[PDB]
Amino acid sequence: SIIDQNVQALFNEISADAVFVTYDGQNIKKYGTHLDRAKTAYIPASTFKIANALIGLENHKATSTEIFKWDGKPRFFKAWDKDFTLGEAMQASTVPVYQELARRIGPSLMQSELQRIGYGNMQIGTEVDQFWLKGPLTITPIQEVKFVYDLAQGQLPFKPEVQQQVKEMLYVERRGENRLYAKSGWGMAVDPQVGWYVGFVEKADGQVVAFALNMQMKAGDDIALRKQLSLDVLDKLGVFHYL
Numbered sequence: 363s364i365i366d367q368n369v370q371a372l373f374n375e376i377s378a379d380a381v382f383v384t385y386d387g388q389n390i391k392k393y394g395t396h397l398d399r400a401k402t403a404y405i406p407a408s409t410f411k412i413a414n415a416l417i418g419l420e421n422h423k424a425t426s427t428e429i430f431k432w433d434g435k436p437r438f439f440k441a442w443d444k445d446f447t448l449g450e451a452m453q454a455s456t457v458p459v460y461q462e463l464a465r466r467i468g469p470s471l472m473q474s475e476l477q478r479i480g481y482g483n484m485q486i487g488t489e490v491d492q493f494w495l496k497g498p499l500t501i502t503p504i505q506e507v508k509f510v511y512d513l514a515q516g517q518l519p520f521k522p523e524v525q526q527q528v529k530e531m532l533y534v535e536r537r538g539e540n541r542l543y544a545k546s547g548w549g550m551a552v553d554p555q556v557g558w559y560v561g562f563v564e565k566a567d568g569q570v571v572a573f574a575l576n577m578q579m580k581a582g583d584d585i586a587l588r589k590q591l592s593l594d595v596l597d598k599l600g601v602f603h604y605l
């Protein structure tokens with residue numbers, strides 16, 4: 363149309379292989395500079411926190427009220443040297459809280475749960491707190507978008523109230539009655555490095571547009587670009603207008 367051009371025009375300034383996928387429940391639409399990324403599998407990096415919190419609440423290894431206390435050994439960011447609920451760590455994207463969670467689940471249950479839901483290639487290897495940060499788990503942008511679409515709908519294979527709790531841990535902001543939910547990721551432990559911005563817009567018409575930005579990253583890049591680009595795209599799409 364003209365909005366496709368407006369969206370693709372945004373990507374004409376981006377000096378990085380990038381793809382942006384949308385899923386409204388019927389149609390996958392793809393935009394960006396390297397459309398083949400949408401079908402390529404990459405480490406989920408911190409976007410796996412979504413599936414990690416689901417599996418862990420579903421299997422009685424944590425609650426969303428439980429405090430994950432700081433054990434004193436300092437952390438990569440100094441904003442991490444605190445106590446966190448699972449929701450507070452989801453939006454701080456605190457990795458050691460969610461590695462502790464994965465150790466609580468264990469490799470056996472982690473593997474069988476990932477098979478049970480069909481997440482990515484469902485591979486975890488031998489390090490139960492490392493597979494999403496360095497492989498072997500990989501997932502395509504198209505898989506991430508359907509996954510978070512079903513989460514928005516409450517249609518993942520989990521107790522309805524577990525989905526609702528992980529859903530609200532992702533909540534970012536609202537504009538009128540439209541609600542943005544999102545989770546960023548930056549996988550530095552792989553070559554190439556992969557950037558994620560996955561989420562969905564819940565409209566007032568009970569309707570959902572899921573989205574997944576996926577792009578290549580290099581050390582030094584603007585950490586704010588993933589979100590600012592995805593929000594630009596959503597506004598050109600008319601899915602989540604600027605106010």
Ligand SMILES: *C(=O)[C@H]([C@@H](C)O)[C@@]1(C)CC(S[C@@H]2CN[C@H](C(=O)N(C)C)C2)=C(C(=O)O)N1
Nearest residue numbers: 407408409455456457495546547548549585
């Ligand atoms: C997640 O994918 C990644 C690794 C460590 O699991 C993580 C948490 C590092 C970064 S970069 C940096 C950390 N938090 C900052 C941030 O979110 N803001 C808003 C300043 C950026 C990310 C990331 O996605 O940015 N994820």
